[PDB]
C-alpha cells in the first residue's frame, strides 16, 4: 500500500543523496512498507533530520499519523502507513 514518501536528508553531503523530494519505496513484495520522519526539537524549534521510506516495522502497522513516542530523546523518530503520511509529524510528550 505505501509506495511513496516525502524525502529529506540533512546529512545529504556525506551520504551523497538528494536533499529533498519524493522517495519511491523499494519493496521486496513479501513485506509492508512505511514512511518515517526524524527531527530534533531543541527547545521548541524543529531541526529536520531525515524523512523517507521505512521497512516492515511492527511499531508502524496501521498507524496513519506519524507520532514519535520515545520520551525526551536526542532525536525524535516516527513512522506511519499510507502514501506521503510523513508529510505531517508530531511527538507525544
Amino acid at each position, epitope marked *: 500500500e505505501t509506495r511513496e514518501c516525502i524525502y529529506y536528508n540533512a*546529512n545529504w553531503e556525506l*551520504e551523497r543523496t538528494n536533499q529533498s523530494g519524493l522517495e519511491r519505496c523499494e519493496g*521486496e513484495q513479501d*513485506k509492508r512498507l512505511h514512511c*518515517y520522519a526524524s527531527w530534533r526539537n531543541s527547545s521548541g524549534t524543529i531541526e529536520l533530520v531525515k524523512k523517507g521510506c*521505512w521497512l*516492515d516495522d*511492527f511499531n508502524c502497522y496501521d498507524r496513519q499519523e506519524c507520532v514519535a513516542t520515545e520520551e525526551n530523546p536526542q*532525536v525524535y523518530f516516527c513512522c506511519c502507513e499510507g502514501n506521503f503520511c510523513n508529510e505531517r509529524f508530531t511527538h507525544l510528550p
Partner: antibody, heavy 114, light 112 residues
Framework: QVQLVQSGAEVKKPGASVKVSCKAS????????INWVRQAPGQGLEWMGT????????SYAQKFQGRVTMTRDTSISTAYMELSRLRSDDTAVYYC????????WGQGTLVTVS | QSALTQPASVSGSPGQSITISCTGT?????????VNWYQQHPGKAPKLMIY???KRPSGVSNRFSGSKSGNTASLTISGLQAEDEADYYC???????????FGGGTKLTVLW
C-alpha cells in the same frame, strides 16, 4: 541481494573492549533497524539490542546495560557494536541482523576472550 | 523481556510432520502477532523461516508454517526432510517499543 557483512574474528584479553562492524548492502541502510544478537558456544541466541540508524537511538538488553555501545556511520552504511570490560564468558559469535524481524543476518563474528 | 519457553529437542522421521512450541503468556504471545522462527544449521548463521506468527518470506519452503493458540506459538514442518535437521529458535519483534527475546531453542533431529 540484501547482505550484512561483519568484521572478522577477534581475540581479546579480559577487561579489554571489542568493536564489531556490520556493513549493509543491497538496501537503504537508513530504511530499517539493526539488531545485535550473540550466541555463546553450545548456547542459544541472546538479544543484545537494537539501533535506529536514522535517529541513532538505541535499546539495550538488561544483561549488557552499562557495557554495550551501539553506533552507526550512515555515510558508509555501517553499524557498530562495542562491548567493554570483557569477561571470559563474553566468548561468543556476535551477529547483526536487519530490522525488527531479523530478516537477514550477518555471517557472525567470533570474539574469543582469553 | 519476558521469557519464551521451547522444548530442548524434538525428533522425527522423514516425511512426518513436527510441531515446535514457543510458550509465553497472555501479555506477550497471547497479545501480539510478533512471534518469529529461525532455523540454524550447525556452524551457520540463523535464517528467518516464519515472521509475524504465520507469515512466510519468499524463498522459504511451503513445508514451513506458523500458528498461535492461546499463549503458545507453533512452528510446523510438514514432509520432514534431512535438511530440516537444525536448531530452531522462536523470538519476538525487536525495535522501537519492543524489547527483543529469543526462546531457548529446540534441537530438531531427523532420524534416517
Amino acid at each position: 541481494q540484501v547482505q550484512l557483512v561483519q568484521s572478522g574474528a577477534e581475540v581479546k584479553k579480559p577487561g579489554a573492549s571489542v568493536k564489531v562492524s556490520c556493513k549493509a548492502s543491497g538496501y537503504t541502510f537508513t530504511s530499517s533497524y539493526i539488531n545485535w544478537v550473540r550466541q555463546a558456544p553450545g548456547q542459544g541466541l541472546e538479544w543484545m539490542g537494537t539501533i535506529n540508524p536514522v535517529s541513532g537511538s538505541t535499546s539495550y538488553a538488561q544483561k549488557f546495560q552499562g557495557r554495550v555501545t551501539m553506533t552507526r556511520d550512515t555515510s558508509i552504511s555501517t553499524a557498530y557494536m562495542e562491548l567493554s570490560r570483557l569477561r571470559s564468558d563474553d566468548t561468543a559469535v556476535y551477529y547483526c541482523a536487519r530490522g525488527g524481524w531479523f530478516d537477514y543476518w550477518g555471517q557472525g563474528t567470533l570474539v574469543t576472550v582469553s | 523481556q519476558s521469557a519464551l519457553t521451547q522444548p530442548a529437542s524434538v525428533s522425527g522421521s522423514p516425511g512426518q510432520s513436527i510441531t515446535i512450541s514457543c510458550t509465553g503468556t497472555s501479555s506477550d504471545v497471547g497479545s501480539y502477532n510478533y512471534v518469529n522462527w529461525y532455523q540454524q544449521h550447525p556452524g551457520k548463521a540463523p535464517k528467518l523461516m516464519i515472521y509475524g506468527v504465520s507469515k512466510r518470506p519468499s524463498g522459504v519452503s511451503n513445508r514451513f508454517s506458523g500458528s498461535k493458540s492461546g499463549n503458545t506459538a507453533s512452528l510446523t514442518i510438514s514432509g520432514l526432510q534431512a535438511e530440516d535437521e537444525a536448531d530452531y529458535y522462536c523470538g519476538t519483534f525487536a525495535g522501537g517499543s519492543y524489547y527483543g527475546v529469543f526462546g531457548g531453542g529446540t534441537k530438531l533431529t531427523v532420524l534416517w
